[PDB]
Structure formats: structure tokens, C-alpha cells
Amino acid sequence: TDPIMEKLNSSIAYDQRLSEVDIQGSMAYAKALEKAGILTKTELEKILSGLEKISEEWSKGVFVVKQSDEDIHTANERRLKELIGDIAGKLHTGRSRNDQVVTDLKLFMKNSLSIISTHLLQLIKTLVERAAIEIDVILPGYTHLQKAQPIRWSQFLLSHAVALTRDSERLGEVKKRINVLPLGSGALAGNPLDIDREMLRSELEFASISLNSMDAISERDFVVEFLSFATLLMIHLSKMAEDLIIYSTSEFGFLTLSDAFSTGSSLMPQKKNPDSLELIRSKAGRVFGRLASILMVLKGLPSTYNKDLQEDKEAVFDVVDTLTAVLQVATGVISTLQISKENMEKALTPEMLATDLALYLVRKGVPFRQAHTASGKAVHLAETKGITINKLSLEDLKSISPQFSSDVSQVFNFVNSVEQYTALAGTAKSSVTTQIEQLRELMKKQKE
Amino acid sequence: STDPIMEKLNSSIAYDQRLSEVDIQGSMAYAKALEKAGILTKTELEKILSGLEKISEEWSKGVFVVKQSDEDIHTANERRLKELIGDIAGKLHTGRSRNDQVVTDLKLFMKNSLSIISTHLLQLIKTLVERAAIEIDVILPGYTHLQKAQPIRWSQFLLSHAVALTRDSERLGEVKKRINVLPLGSGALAGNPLDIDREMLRSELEFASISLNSMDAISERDFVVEFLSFATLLMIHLSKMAEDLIIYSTSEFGFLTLSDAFSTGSSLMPQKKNPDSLELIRSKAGRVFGRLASILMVLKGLPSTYNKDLQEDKEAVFDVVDTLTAVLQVATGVISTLQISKENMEKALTPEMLATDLALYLVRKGVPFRQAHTASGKAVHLAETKGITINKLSLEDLKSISPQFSSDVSQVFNFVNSVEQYTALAGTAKSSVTTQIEQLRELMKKQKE
Amino acid sequence: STDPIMEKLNSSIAYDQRLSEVDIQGSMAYAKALEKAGILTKTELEKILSGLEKISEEWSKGVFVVKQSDEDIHTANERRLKELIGDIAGKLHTGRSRNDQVVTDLKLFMKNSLSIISTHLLQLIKTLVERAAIEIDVILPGYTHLQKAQPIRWSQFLLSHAVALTRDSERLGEVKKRINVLPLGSGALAGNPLDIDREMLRSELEFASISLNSMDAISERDFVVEFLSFATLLMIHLSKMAEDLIIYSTSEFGFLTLSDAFSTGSSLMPQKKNPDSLELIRSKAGRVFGRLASILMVLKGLPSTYNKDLQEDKEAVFDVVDTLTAVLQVATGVISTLQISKENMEKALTPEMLATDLALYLVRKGVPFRQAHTASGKAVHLAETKGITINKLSLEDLKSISPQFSSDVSQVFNFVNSVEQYTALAGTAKSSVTTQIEQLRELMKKQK
Amino acid sequence: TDPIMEKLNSSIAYDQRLSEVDIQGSMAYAKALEKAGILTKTELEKILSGLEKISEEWSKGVFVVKQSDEDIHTANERRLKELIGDIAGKLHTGRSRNDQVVTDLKLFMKNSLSIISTHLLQLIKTLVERAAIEIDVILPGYTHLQKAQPIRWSQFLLSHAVALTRDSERLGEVKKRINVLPLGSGALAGNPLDIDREMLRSELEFASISLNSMDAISERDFVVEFLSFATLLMIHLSKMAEDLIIYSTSEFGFLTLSDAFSTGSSLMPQKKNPDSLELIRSKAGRVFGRLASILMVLKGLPSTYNKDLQEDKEAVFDVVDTLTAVLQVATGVISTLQISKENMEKALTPEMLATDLALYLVRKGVPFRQAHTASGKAVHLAETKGITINKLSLEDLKSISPQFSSDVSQVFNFVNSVEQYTALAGTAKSSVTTQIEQLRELMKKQKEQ
């Protein structure tokens, strides 16, 4: 056996975090083997005790890895043997590395996804809570990154909560396809000892059992799916990071992040670098890379098991750790950032109310195209007098369209600007309250 | 220096014309809501609708006519409306914007495309499951590392693909539910400014729910990414199935032959068939994956809310939808019409693949896994040294390796008995494959619904 | 009996018509070689060449007429020729195959196409370079983490993009060279069986050399992947520049404005332009990357030699060729016609950005950086205390911090002198910029 | 200072590989600081002495890192003080982490590219040499994975070597741009102390120096290009692996991998699983994944430096180690695999010569169309007569075309088949010989790195 190739087959270098699930998997199997008559009652006790002690060695961090261990499965098998003797060997009866590895990665993923879920909900929750509290703050809404119209700071925050909520929904969909036991699939044709797979499932807490052994052994859908979910999640987070990074520019002045999530220099204590957000944005590429790699690893592979499939572990681990860290960093950034109502408020400009001005007419029967030209004509005027549109006199307005009354003054108020969007999903106060209620409901659904 | 070339990039009319009917539908739904909102008088309405319907027909009969001024499908339809009805149709744009219209049209279009793709997907699944039911007695080699591992039923192989496809169908449904949400009424960014009744819009357009936030509804393209993720994984599945059949159809394996319609030949080598169909299907995985990749890269780093960049979704969605619709039917064809060679499949099974069963023989007699496995190795080695296959070792020779080998060991050297060992749920044993067929059928019912 | 969908799925006519010309030229070259090989007589060659030149025209004047039987452009032409000069046309295919004829057309098309792209890429670089010389005096903020870091010449900025784009040009050349290798004469996969004169084919089609291995030349698509990698990196550069320009054109930054030609707007908000151009360019980065990912996966895992999978190459090549041609030109237009605001740019220059140079003042005076930094720190510190900008601190005050401060420390508080510190090669000092402009001019001459 | 954050910026666990390059970057800068008049000659010798001592520590591998260390950089600085004192602090003078980090990576990549180049050339040499030795072996050439026509085993081996040769040419082109000095660009606007960048260049063995400070700090083209070269190379390797995997199947039986690059069961000692090839093939996805990530990280970023660029190290390290391991595994596989000349021979069939039969007529003046027709008629005749085309008698052939003469007997010989392809790059022996020598020349030009 070649030196370099052996080092490539060697997963022991990173697959150690699968120690516990590999042990849990073995315990269930040993139980099913005793029920099948492959093990005696006493043997089972010996095995379980052995497996339990091994579990402790890892949790305590005292487990010793022999250079002869190519993977975590070999390590535990070797240990279990030097712990209870020959009897240890009977444990691998009819089992295969092929269905052991998938059972292991799936258990690990079910647990990790459970952890990713809490952080994700915590982020969404954090976003929603500030949307509640800062519901009066208004700032410009952008399109093409050019000030378009006023919107509530909360409508902006909520848009990110809503996207994340979808991420959460997908996470759940992926979580249930992962919650299917693949153990007892053997090398590819199934388990040859009529092993009780139902006992296996309930013992390991899966929701159901894999339908086809060839599929169960060679499919990495659960890996691709998780990656697809993780990548779109990062897209959302990269979009939010981009918004904030920009808003935190001295130019915009909208906000600045706490010191914990930014860096700085004693030469310019008035500027803060949003490292936190830059890191989050960059992880999108990192996670996408993993998605792209596994997809290509799978394209073209014939049935059933192929060594190519070992690339899955490192991709999942890296993604699980990336999301776990980035999600929390995002929650903190959101809860501890400081907006500037002042600058955010001074950002609002009269010119932005021009569209609302055209709406004022539409509400008085004046047709669409006709109102537009009227509103556009009104700007041209104030424009030629060196004054904003909210300033031009009532008489000036009259000359362009008799439709303009004295109430037209109401149009030049930002609170009024946003209150226009009462229709479901709008930036109006009422709509924002509705949304806040809906997200909290959806979060309850995705749990109880 | 290219203002004209700039305009060309914004041009979409060359490919978005398949959106004509969804655009018209969205406009009729909005006009109505515009009347309830009083923006339009009842009469103003009836004339608008009648105008949108004349346009509906113009496309539904290829009689429409685009001018060298129609930037896109929208402009092309509103221009014809200003031409049919007149200066009145202008009151329709009141309230909503292109940012609002765009996603509404794409979601309506995708919803229909998905349902169609689902039918084709389900047909493929039914074809595999059906063929698995009929050829349940066929046995061939099960492979790992493209090497003969152990005997398996040909049906187990077919069902492994059907099972994977079933997950594809489940994802398709999840992606469709998120697409069946009304985005119309979000306006250009902050929502509709006329308190338009969105429920009515939902009802008219037949969406299942209404979008929650106007900013999200206008800037998000999750439904596009998700669709592409579903498509790419589905393609991965199909690429694998194509690869398997390509290999099995080689003269070397000789397990099966594609029908004339899904393959090509040559006058000089009539008995030779190239698996054109399978190669096309396999090559589409990359094509679909690329679309996934492009959209993902297009979305990454974009700030709120709407940005021109999002205009790249249409072309990727159209390509993948057509690709999927064609690929799926071709695969159904291929599986439905290919010819298998029972003789060659069975002939490929060898005694050497039964060494594992030999070891299991001892395990069932109580011998420890290790001892048994070691004994089978010795038997394999002995036969090898005598230059004979293990199914020919005499009983004496076997007992010289372990007395546990009784005269009944002969039963081990039977390929049917080999696959019949796998009765545990999901195995290749006949009872197990039968069970799989019932489970899938019952799944095709939840997916059909 | 072929399946109708299989049929349609195999039709490239819809898009491969643009290969009409190069297909004929390949056929012309091959015919001439068939005459020399004794497969055709001069009389037959003349009749064939004449029938081909006729088809050429039919495409030129857009007169050519395609029929539903035309699966691909190769069939459209071969059929047309048969109609024109009778079944003598059949001989033209002697020893030739779709396999080597299809990759011959693709390289020829790409060679021509790349030639046009080179021109446009060079015109963009030039536009950037010439602008850098003209506005070399302009000074504005330099960003790190999208936060003001220190004064930089505006030209230093334009040039960083020209420099990146020149690397793109260098790659474009390296790719062109490998594309400029004749594949015709490779036959179906084992080579040409008629001892055809490939050197003659090369000379006629004008390639620089001939392919080394028939199998490789028919199965590899390195030339496509490589072109796509070059295009993708180019788009990245362009996407970054786009990002910079979109942000600079924000009301908030106000550093510049785009002409109406490459922008979009509203009659309700005259004082506002949306950078549609720059946004298109950025979006195309993904689009082109998509093609790259596409072909890489199509090729991955494919066996030797020819496979129908390779048919996906054309659509990917055409898309990117057209995308780059359109985008590169638009970029040029955007870069040449945009108007900067020297006022807002210098305005952005604040004394807080000279805190760094204050320390450098001490290091030149001999003060160890560790100490000169903490020194400048006390300065900004005491500066805030007195509620004044560091440029207002008195010599007396500066001395209380470090005796090394003299009357000249006053110069450190000048933007021109701030920038003029970077005279080291590639720095932002005017002399460094001019050296750059000159250097870029030299590179542009050689790559021609 | 957040704990998760701090852990995200850490890189000491993986960037230690950059120890020696970092120190070399310090010695260089230190000397440049002495010329700028910041470090007295006495201080220069003081530092250079320490820096060497620390570098000397890593060398013997006795260096020690503390938990306080985050960057391989700070790990070296911290240790500089522990040996030299406060004077160490002057090394930072006018030097940013921005040009210091891009300098370490290029210096590292340049050295990695050299190692990688060597292995690549070793792989090419192994293929070309084996081809020269087994130049007489003939086997089926495949198209759509179906026997298409006789070819020389060496023609097959050479097609891969040729592709691999272009990879080696891409390596050189990439190394060229990597071999440029970025140091002295500072944090963004360049070096502020008029540092002598020509001295740094000479000292760091770079070929030239960066043209623009902003570009040199923010660009990661060099990372992209390298990844692009690696991915194209891995594609090539995945194609070769697919081939060998297929050729090593029992069904094909064309060759067997040595025990060193394959897995096997004691129960089936004949079964040979091509682990080595599968590993190589799977790394293609792993590498492309890296390319994909960095590309998405760079997309849409604004000038100049952004913390995003930090994701480059791990991508480069992964692919550098992967390419190094994979290339050597490839080399091993190709030189230690045993071919079955006999099975490659028995795979050549008479049916694969109908094409040659038509060509026989073409050389005697018969037009392509008619030639192809006579041959096919000969195929039908042998079919109806129950024999193979080579068994048809002269009379059988004459009755199809008078142009057939007793000399047609030579058409039914596989050596003569491949010998028809004498045209440049064809599979005729003389052509294969010409390739071997063209490739040796090419390996020479490149070897002269």
C-alpha cells in the first residue's frame, strides 16, 4: 500500500468528531444483533459497557489514537477490542463501513442542524425585536442604491427577517429527510441477517427507515440539500452584511457597530471597520464552494458506493461550523449596533416626496399619466426658484393643476409618506405590526 | 461608447415573450382591484379587460406583432393596449411598478412550469417502479468501485433510482409551495400606495398566500435559487442513472440495449448503438448546475432592495425549465423502451461473489464473524490453489477448513438464495423489493396530489 | 423513428448558424487537401470551391434558406452544396468527421471572436489610462473596509483597475495561442486515414501549428474552459469596478455621476441617476461564471474519447463572447463619459486622515514607530479634548507630546504632501502615477 | 472584542506554513529599512541575526507558539522581541499587514508551484515513457463508450500527456504573474518611506514588482488563476481516472492496478477496487469547489482591502496539498499498472474494420458514398452467410465491387488498420513516435522553468 494514497484514504484526521455517533450507532446495532441471536445477553452487556467506556474516553478527551487508525470507525473498533477481547469482533457482523458512515454523518447532521436552528431563530427573533422597538425610525429606501422613497427602519429589518424565516423553513425540510435511518443497508444489497431496522430506528431516534439499500448507501442528497440551504442562507446574510457595511460608512452615517464587532485605530477613533460584516459576506463564497464541490463530486458517479463520496465530511463540518459562528456573530451585530435617528432622519429629502405628490392627484380623480406630468411639472418650478417642492406656494401649485388644495401640505410629511402603504406587506405602521405578528407566529409553528 | 449597445442588454423581448399570458393575467387581476379601489370606473374596467383579452388571443394565435421599440414583454403588451383601447389603458400602471410585475409574472410562469415538470417527473418514477415490478426476477451484479460486489435484483437497482427521484419530487413540492405566494402589490419597494386589496389579487391570480414584506418580495430570488437547486440535484440523479445505463449498454457489459429512437448507430456496424439519449441527459447536469451557479453569484453581495442585476433570473429559469421538461421525458422513454439481456446479467454473476455468503453460512451456525470470514478466505485460497471455483470445493476440502461446513453448504452457491438473504426492510430480497414498490406507489399518490 | 424530443434536444441549428462562415472555410481548405491527396481532381475541386463560395454569399446577404431537416449548420451547408453542385459534394467528407470538423469551426470562431474582444479590452484599459493622466491632480479618499483610510490620487484608483485589466489582456493572449492550433485532420478519433496534408490545412485556415494527438484534439475542450476562466476573472474585475462606481455615484458619496446614456432616472426626481450600466456589468459576472461552472461539470468524469456531452460547448462560448463584447464596450463608454466632482472629492478629505502622516513625521525625525504612533495618538486625543482638529494643535502642544516636533510639522497637514509621500514605485505620488501611465502604455504596445 | 469573532480571524492553526516566507519577507524589508535610514547598520545585523535564529527554530522544528499568537505574523514578531528586544518594533515601520500578507502568499505559492511543476512533469514523463515502451499494443478506441476503431494503447496514453502538457504550460504562465513583488505597497497608497522596492525585489528573488499599490493589495487574480489551472488539471486527471477505472473493470479486463494503489478483500482476492483513481477523480470536485469559493468571495467587492480576502489562504493550501498528493498517486498508478495485452487484443473485432474496408475502396478511386455503400453491403452479406466480414472470399467481395482485389486481405489486420493514420497526430506508429519526441521537447522547454 502506497504512503501518499494511504494518507488520502485516512479520514481519522478530521472524522474524530463522529466518535460519539459512531458509538451510539454501534450500541443500537449490538442491541439488534442480540435480538437476532448473533450476540448472547452477556456479550451485549460486555459490548455496551465497552462502548460506554469508549464514549467516556472521547468526552474526557483521553482517547488515544493509534497511528494505525485510518478512520474513527477503526479506532473505536480497535479500542473496543483491547477493552473486552474477542467478543468485540462479533459487533461488525453483517455491518458495513458503507452504511455506518452515512448513519454517522446523518446523526451528526441532525444534531448540528438542531444547533444551527436555534441560532437562526435567535437571529430572526433579534431582528424582529428591534423592528418592534424602533418602529418609528424612518430612513430612505433604496433602489439601484439611489434614494427612492421613505420607509420604516423596521420594514428594512423585517425584510431580512422574512428571508431568514424561509431559510428556517427550508432547514426544517432538510432536517426531516436527514432524520431517516440508513443503518442496516449493508455494503449495498441490504443487511443479510434480517436485522430489526425498526428497533434500530427507535434506538437511534430517527423518524423512519431508508427505503432502498443501494440508494441509502450511495446518495448524498442530505449533504447537497444542507449545502443548498446553507448557501442561500449565506446569500441572505451577505445581502444584509452589504446593507449594513454601506450604512455604516461615514458617508451614509446611518449607523455604527459596537466595538466587539468592528476594528479601529487610535489614530482615527472616529472610524470603525465592520470586520464582522465583511467576514459574514466572505463566508458566502466559502459555503458556496462546498456546495459546488460536492455537486461535482457526485456528477457522473455510477452506482453504488464509490470512494469519491468521502469528500462529504469535510464539506459538512466546515459548513456546520461556519453557519454556527456567522449566525451568532450576526445576532450580536444586530442587537448591539447603534443607529443614528438624526442622520437617518436627515437623509430624508423633499425630492423623495415627488411621487407621493403625484399620488395626491390620483386620489382626486386626476388620471395616472396626467398626474405624473403634473407632479413632474411641479418639481421643474420649485427647481427654477431655488426652493424645494414642499416650499413652492399654494398659488404656484394651483397654476399647474387646480386639483392642488391646501391639504397638499400633508403630502410633505414623512410619517404620512409611509402611512400610505397600509396594504398588506407595506411599510405602513399597521402593516409593520402585522408582519411582526406573522413572523412570531411562523416561529412558533416551526417548533411546537 | 455605446448607448445603443446598452439598450440591447436591457432588451428581453427576444426571450420573455413566453410570459405574455401571465403578464396579461396579472394585469387583469390588477385592473379589477383598481376598480374596487375606485381608480377605475366599472365601464373603464370592462374596456380594459376586453383589451387585455384581445391581446391574449393575439399571442394565443401567433398573430401578435412586436415592434422594434418593444424593450420587453411588458412594454410590448401595454403598447398594444394603448393601441386597442387607447389613452385610457394608461390608468392601469397606477400603483404597481415593474419591480412588482416582474416577480409576479415569473412566479405565475414557474408555478405552471413546475406542475408540468412534476407530471413528467412522476411518469419517470412510475416507469421505473412499473419496470421493477415486471422484471423482479432478474438478477445481476451489484457494483462498488465499478467492481462486482454481490448479486442483487435488477429491480433493486431500478428502485434505488426511483427512490432518489421521489425525494426530487418532494423538494419540487416544497419549492412550489413557496412559489405559490402572491408578490403583486408590493409596489416598487415600499408596497402598493393605494391600499389595493391584495386578497382579491391573490384570489384572481390563484396564489395560495400573499407576500409578507414588500422589500423582500421585490428583491428576493430565493424561489429561483431553490428551483435551480431542485433542478441540479434532480440532474445529478439523472446523470448517475445515465452513467449506469451507458456502462451497462457497452458491449463489454452487455446487460442492455437502448431502443433505436433513443440511440444512434452506423451503417458499417449495425450491431452497434451509441447511447445518445443518456449522453444528452448526463450533459445537462452541468448545464443546469451552471444556471444555479450564475444566479447564486448574481445575488451574492447585492444590497437592498431592487437592482438591475436581478434581470438575469428569467433566462436561467427558462433554460432549466425547458431542459428539465425534455430530459425527463427522454429518460422515461429510455427506461420504458430499453431491452435487457437476462442471459448476460445472470451470466455475469460469479461464484467468487459468494465468498461473503459462505462466511455468513458459518455465522448463522454460530461461528464468530472473524473465524467465519477467515474460514471463507481459506476456502477461497484452497480452491484457488486447486485451480477450481469455490462452489466446486468438495465437502471434505471444506471440512478440512472447518467442520462447521455441513453438506447443506451447497445451498450457498445459488444466486437466488444469495439475494434472498436480504429480507430486512429495503434489502434486495424479493419480499423487500415488493414492499418498496408498494411504498413508492403510495408516495406517488402523495406527490400526485 | 428517432424520438421527437430527442430530435429537438439534438438540434443546434437554432444557434450554430453563426458558425456558417468558418464551416465553409474549413470545407474549402479540406477540399483543397483532398485534391492534393488525389481524392478529388482539379475539375472537382473547382466545382466544389465555387459551390461553397456561393453558400458563403447566401449567408452574407442573409439569403440562405434553412429547412426543418437541417439538424445543425454542418448539415445545412452540406445539403445546400449538394443542391448546388450535385452529389459530387459527397466526396468532400472523405476522411473527415463531425468530431474534428466541429472543433475546427469552434476554434476558428473563437480565434476571430477573441480578436474582437482583445480590441475592446485594450480600448477599456486605454480609456482608463488616458483618464488617469488627465485627472492626475485630483485627490480623494482611499478606502479600506469601505472606510476613509488616507488621501489618494483619483488616478491611482483608475489605474488599479487598468492594471488588473491588463493582466486580463495577458491571459487573453495566452488562451488565444492554444486556441490557434489546428485540429482538422484528426478524423473521428484516430486521426485522418488518407494521409491528408495537415500542414496544408494549417496554412489555408491560418492556424499557427497543428494538434499533436488526434484523440486529445477531438475530446479536449481546454480552450473553452480556459476562455471561460479568462472571461470570469475579467468579469470579476469589472464587477469590482462596477461596485466602486455604483457606490461613488451615490447621493451619499456624491463623488461622481454617469452620463444619461449609461444611466436611468425619473422626471419626478431629476437630481438622481440610476447606474443601470454598472449594474448590468456586475450581473454579467455571475452569468459568465455560470458558463464556466457549466462546462467544467460537463467535462468532469467523461471517458475518452468523443462524447455527445461535449455538444454543450457552443452555447456557453457564444453567450460569453457576446456578453464580453457588449459589456467591455459599455464599460469604456461609462468610464469615458462619467463626470467626477473634484469638489466633493477633496471635500471628503479630512484632517483626521492625516493622523497617520503625523507619526511618519516623527519616524523621519528618528522617532521609533512604536513611540511615534503613541505620540500621534496623544495628539488626536488632546485634539478632541480641546474640541479641535489635529491640524490646529500648537507647536507648544505638539512639543509637550514630543520634543521632536518642530515648525515644519505644519507641512504634514496638507493633502498634496500627504499623497506625495508615496514616491516609491507604485505609490500614489504623482511621479509614481506618471511612471504607471507610461508603463501601462508600454504593455499595451507589446500586446500588439 | 467578541469571542466567536476572534476565533474567526484566527489563522494560526493553518497559516504556520508561511513561517519561513514571512521571516524572509522581514529580513528583506529590514535591509530595506537600513537603506531608508530607519535601522542603523548595528540594528540591522541585530535583527537579521534574530530573524535567522527564529527561522532556525522552525527549521529544526523546535519553535514554540503561544495561545496569544493569532497570525503566523504575530507569532514571528512576538518571538522577535523575546530575543532582540524593543528594537524589533521598528520592523513594522511603514509596513502594513496588507502587503505583508500578499507577499507571504506569493512567495509561498511560487515555491509550491515549483514543487507542483516537478510532479506534473514527472507524470507526463511517466506517460510518454510507458507509451514509447508499449508502442506495439493495440486496443479499441472509444466513442460514446462503444468500440469505434483500432488505436494504439500509446495513442491513448499520449492524448492525456498532451492535455497534461498544456496544464504545465498554464502553470508556468501563472507562476510568471505570481513571481512579482507586492511588498512596499503598504496598506493602500504605497510605501510612505520611499522604501527601495528594487532592493526588496532582488532580496526576495522576485522577477519584477507590482505596478499599482491598490491593485497589489486587493487583487487575488493569482489565487484565481492558480485555482483555475488546478481545476483544469483535475478535470484532465478525472478523465484519465474514469478511463482506467472502466478499463480495469472485469468486463473490460484491459488492465489491473498494483496492490499499492488499490483495495481488495480477502474474500475476493481477484476483485481490485481502484481507490487511487477514485480519490483522484473525487478531488476534481474538491478543487473546483475552492475555485468557486474564491470567485464568489471576490465578486462585487469594492476597492481596496476588505477582510473578505482572508479566505484565500485556506483555498490555496488545500489545492496545493491536493495537487501534490494526487499527481504522485497518478504517477504511481500509471507506472505500476499491468496491462493485459491479450485482452486488449481479443477486444479487437472484424466488425470494427468495415470502415477500413470502405477506405480500401476510396484509395482505389471509388467515391466515398459508393465506397461506404459497398462496405455495408459486405457487412450484410457476411451476416446472411453466417460469418464475419474478414471470412468473406474474394469472390464474395468481387460480387459486391470489382475494385476489390486479393490485396484487400490486408484490410483484416489490426496493425495495418492503425498504420493508415500516418498523418500528423494520428495513431500510426511513426506518428506516435513523432509525438513522443515532440512531448520530450515540450517537457524540456518547460523543465527549463
Coordinates of N, CA, C and O in Angstrom, one line a residue, chain B residues 108-163:
Chain B
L108 N -45.9 33.1 -11.5 CA -47.1 32.5 -12.1 C -46.5 31.5 -13.2 O -47.0 30.4 -13.3
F109 N -45.6 32.0 -14.0 CA -45.0 31.1 -15.0 C -44.3 29.9 -14.4 O -44.6 28.8 -14.8
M110 N -43.5 30.1 -13.4 CA -42.9 28.9 -12.7 C -43.9 27.9 -12.1 O -43.7 26.7 -12.2
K111 N -44.9 28.4 -11.5 CA -45.9 27.6 -10.9 C -46.5 26.6 -12.0 O -46.7 25.4 -11.7
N112 N -46.7 27.1 -13.2 CA -47.2 26.3 -14.3 C -46.2 25.3 -14.8 O -46.5 24.2 -15.0
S113 N -45.0 25.8 -14.9 CA -43.9 25.0 -15.4 C -43.6 23.9 -14.4 O -43.4 22.7 -14.9
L114 N -43.6 24.2 -13.2 CA -43.4 23.1 -12.1 C -44.4 22.0 -12.2 O -44.0 20.8 -12.1
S115 N -45.7 22.4 -12.3 CA -46.7 21.4 -12.3 C -46.5 20.4 -13.5 O -46.7 19.2 -13.4
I116 N -46.0 21.0 -14.6 CA -45.7 20.3 -15.9 C -44.5 19.4 -15.6 O -44.5 18.2 -16.0
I117 N -43.5 19.9 -15.0 CA -42.3 19.2 -14.7 C -42.6 18.0 -13.8 O -42.0 17.0 -13.8
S118 N -43.6 18.3 -12.9 CA -44.0 17.3 -11.9 C -44.6 16.1 -12.6 O -44.3 14.9 -12.3
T119 N -45.4 16.4 -13.6 CA -46.1 15.3 -14.3 C -45.0 14.4 -15.0 O -45.1 13.2 -14.9
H120 N -44.1 15.1 -15.7 CA -43.0 14.3 -16.3 C -42.2 13.6 -15.3 O -41.9 12.4 -15.5
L121 N -41.9 14.2 -14.2 CA -41.1 13.5 -13.1 C -41.9 12.3 -12.6 O -41.3 11.2 -12.4
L122 N -43.1 12.4 -12.3 CA -43.9 11.3 -11.8 C -44.0 10.2 -12.8 O -44.0 9.0 -12.4
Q123 N -44.1 10.5 -14.1 CA -44.2 9.5 -15.2 C -42.9 8.7 -15.1 O -43.0 7.4 -15.3
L124 N -41.8 9.3 -15.0 CA -40.5 8.6 -15.0 C -40.5 7.7 -13.8 O -40.1 6.5 -14.0
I125 N -40.9 8.2 -12.6 CA -40.9 7.3 -11.4 C -41.8 6.1 -11.7 O -41.4 5.0 -11.4
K126 N -43.0 6.4 -12.2 CA -43.9 5.3 -12.4 C -43.4 4.3 -13.4 O -43.6 3.1 -13.3
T127 N -42.6 4.8 -14.4 CA -42.0 3.9 -15.4 C -40.9 2.9 -14.7 O -40.8 1.8 -15.1
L128 N -40.1 3.5 -13.8 CA -39.1 2.7 -13.1 C -39.8 1.7 -12.2 O -39.5 0.5 -12.3
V129 N -40.7 2.1 -11.4 CA -41.4 1.3 -10.5 C -42.2 0.2 -11.2 O -42.2 -1.0 -10.8
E130 N -42.8 0.5 -12.4 CA -43.5 -0.4 -13.1 C -42.6 -1.5 -13.7 O -42.8 -2.7 -13.6
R131 N -41.4 -1.1 -14.3 CA -40.5 -2.0 -14.8 C -39.9 -2.9 -13.7 O -39.5 -4.0 -14.0
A132 N -39.8 -2.3 -12.5 CA -39.2 -3.1 -11.4 C -40.2 -4.2 -11.0 O -39.8 -5.3 -10.6
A133 N -41.5 -3.9 -11.1 CA -42.5 -4.9 -10.8 C -42.5 -6.1 -11.7 O -42.5 -7.2 -11.3
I134 N -42.3 -5.8 -13.0 CA -42.3 -6.9 -14.0 C -41.0 -7.7 -14.1 O -41.0 -8.9 -14.3
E135 N -39.9 -7.0 -13.9 CA -38.6 -7.7 -14.0 C -38.0 -8.0 -12.7 O -36.8 -8.1 -12.5
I136 N -38.9 -8.2 -11.7 CA -38.5 -8.5 -10.3 C -37.7 -9.8 -10.1 O -37.0 -10.0 -9.1
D137 N -37.7 -10.7 -11.1 CA -37.0 -11.9 -11.0 C -35.6 -11.8 -11.6 O -34.7 -12.7 -11.5
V138 N -35.3 -10.7 -12.3 CA -34.0 -10.6 -12.9 C -32.9 -10.2 -11.9 O -33.0 -9.3 -11.1
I139 N -31.8 -11.0 -12.0 CA -30.6 -10.8 -11.1 C -29.3 -10.5 -11.9 O -29.0 -11.2 -12.9
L140 N -28.6 -9.5 -11.4 CA -27.3 -9.1 -12.0 C -26.3 -8.7 -10.9 O -26.7 -8.6 -9.7
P141 N -25.1 -8.4 -11.3 CA -24.1 -7.9 -10.3 C -24.4 -6.6 -9.6 O -24.7 -5.6 -10.3
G142 N -24.2 -6.5 -8.3 CA -24.3 -5.2 -7.6 C -22.8 -4.7 -7.6 O -21.9 -5.5 -7.2
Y143 N -22.6 -3.4 -8.0 CA -21.3 -2.9 -8.0 C -20.9 -1.8 -7.0 O -21.6 -1.0 -6.6
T144 N -19.6 -1.9 -6.6 CA -19.0 -0.9 -5.8 C -17.6 -0.7 -6.4 O -16.8 -1.6 -6.7
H145 N -17.2 0.6 -6.6 CA -15.9 0.9 -7.2 C -16.0 0.3 -8.6 O -14.9 0.0 -9.2
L146 N -17.1 0.2 -9.2 CA -17.4 -0.4 -10.5 C -16.8 -1.8 -10.6 O -16.4 -2.3 -11.7
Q147 N -16.8 -2.5 -9.5 CA -16.4 -3.9 -9.4 C -17.5 -4.7 -8.9 O -18.3 -4.2 -8.0
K148 N -17.6 -5.9 -9.3 CA -18.7 -6.8 -8.9 C -18.6 -7.1 -7.4 O -17.6 -7.6 -6.9
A149 N -19.6 -6.6 -6.7 CA -19.6 -6.8 -5.2 C -20.4 -8.1 -4.9 O -19.9 -9.0 -4.4
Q150 N -21.7 -8.0 -5.1 CA -22.6 -9.2 -4.8 C -23.8 -9.2 -5.6 O -24.2 -8.1 -6.1
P151 N -24.5 -10.3 -5.7 CA -25.7 -10.5 -6.5 C -26.8 -9.6 -6.0 O -27.0 -9.4 -4.7
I152 N -27.6 -8.9 -6.9 CA -28.7 -8.1 -6.5 C -29.8 -8.2 -7.5 O -29.5 -8.6 -8.7
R153 N -31.0 -7.9 -7.2 CA -32.1 -8.0 -8.2 C -32.0 -6.7 -9.0 O -31.8 -5.6 -8.5
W154 N -32.2 -6.9 -10.3 CA -32.2 -5.8 -11.3 C -33.2 -4.7 -10.8 O -33.0 -3.5 -11.0
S155 N -34.3 -5.2 -10.2 CA -35.3 -4.3 -9.7 C -34.9 -3.4 -8.6 O -35.3 -2.2 -8.5
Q156 N -34.0 -3.9 -7.7 CA -33.5 -3.2 -6.6 C -32.7 -2.0 -7.2 O -32.9 -0.8 -6.7
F157 N -32.0 -2.2 -8.2 CA -31.3 -1.2 -8.9 C -32.2 -0.1 -9.5 O -31.9 1.1 -9.4
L158 N -33.3 -0.5 -10.1 CA -34.3 0.4 -10.6 C -34.9 1.3 -9.6 O -35.2 2.5 -9.7
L159 N -35.3 0.6 -8.5 CA -35.9 1.3 -7.4 C -35.0 2.3 -6.6 O -35.5 3.2 -6.1
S160 N -33.7 2.0 -6.7 CA -32.8 2.9 -6.0 C -32.8 4.2 -6.7 O -32.7 5.3 -6.1
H161 N -33.0 4.2 -8.0 CA -33.1 5.5 -8.7 C -34.5 6.1 -8.5 O -34.6 7.3 -8.3
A162 N -35.5 5.3 -8.5 CA -36.9 5.8 -8.3 C -37.0 6.4 -6.9 O -37.6 7.5 -6.8
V163 N -36.4 5.8 -5.9 CA -36.5 6.4 -4.6 C -35.8 7.7 -4.6 O -36.4 8.7 -4.0

